[PDB]
Amino acid sequence: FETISSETLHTGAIFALRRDQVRIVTREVVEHFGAVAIVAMDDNGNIPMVYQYRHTYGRRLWELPAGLLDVAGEPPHLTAARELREEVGLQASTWQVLVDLDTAPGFSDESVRVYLATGLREVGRTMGWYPIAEAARRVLRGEIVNSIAIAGVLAVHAVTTGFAQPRPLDTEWIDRPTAFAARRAER
């Protein structure tokens, strides 16, 4: 394919709208920072999940601890650990790549990297702990709909059943976003 022209329609706080002419059709793309989420499994096979309000839906959704890659230069790995700390008060000795997901391939360039964190310590000084199998049944029951949470929960479920394995932190993130970050629209 060929990108004829690129035009910015609007730049917001967390994303930008750009219209491209493609080889000829209009292709409006929502540039995004990209994000990271964490599936922190304890030694008993349970994971922590948060209950957060999502304006887009006008209600609260059960999700994995997660955050945007809105810190220029900060490694996703670091961002993920920082978020696990802030969100559920946990630090993990081990970090591996569970699954990457492209949220809305149809209109945005956001990609989310989900990590599997184990060897947990409770640090610091709404959320719930769910056994992985129950979290999985919740997904298949519609109680968990957030796309990042679905991927993470079913992915770790496939891992805890012996079906698959996690991955090295250095696993390539094929679609990690870069456009919105490259704009540096701030200051």
80 contributes a contact to a second copy by CB under 8 A: no
Rounded distance between C-alpha atoms, residue 4 and residue 101, angstroms: 28
What is the per-residue binding string for a second copy in 94-133, x denoting contact by CB under 8 A? Answer: -----xxxxxxxxxxxxx---------------------x
User: Closest separation between CB of residue 43 and a second copy, Å?
Assistant: 22
User: Closest separation between CB of residue 120 and a second copy, Å?
Assistant: 22
186 contributes a contact to a second copy by CB under 8 A: no
5 contributes a contact to a second copy by CB under 8 A: no
Q: Residue 66 pairs with which residues in a beta bridge?
A: 37
86 contributes a contact to a second copy by CB under 8 A: no
CB neighbour class for 44 (10 Å; exposed up to 12, middle 13-18, buried from 19): exposed
Rounded distance between C-alpha atoms, residue 83 and residue 95, angstroms: 13
DSSP state of 184: -
Nearest residue to 80 (alpha-carbon basis) of 62, 68, 72, 94? 68
Give the relative orientation of helices 147-160 and 132-139 as an angle to the nearest 10 degrees: 130
Q: Which of 124, 174, 184, 186 binds a second copy (CB under 8 A)?
A: 174
**Residues lying near a second copy in the complex (CB under 8 A):** 1, 9-10, 12-15, 17, 19-20, 22, 26-30, 32, 35, 53-57, 59, 61, 63, 68, 99-111, 133, 136-137, 139-142, 145-148, 150-151, 154-155, 157-159, 161, 163-165, 167, 171-172, 174-175
